[PDB]
Design a protein around this ligand. Sequence first.
Ligand SMILES: [Zn+2]
Length: 106
Amino acid sequence: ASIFRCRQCGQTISRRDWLLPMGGDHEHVVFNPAGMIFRVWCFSLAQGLRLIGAPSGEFSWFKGYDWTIALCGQCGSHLGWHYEGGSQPQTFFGLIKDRLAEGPAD
Ligand SMILES: [Zn+2]
């Protein structure tokens, strides 16, 4: 269990080694304006996504960061968000834990 794939299709997305403890925990639980709860895992790095549109600061869950929707690049499943425009780090990924599958490295 060292890499994370898209649960819906298998696309390679990230690695346990790339988990990032933002504010002391790699895990953050948050809701959007529609009341949906997400268990977000922060990653320094991810791949196999497609970042949609341009960044927005509106309702951002992480102070100083602007967000872009991150879809699985293969199947289009909403996997999380890419954060940018902030400080230490300037950028990171917040990925929705239950949308990934963990397993052995390729
Ligand atoms: Zn996918």
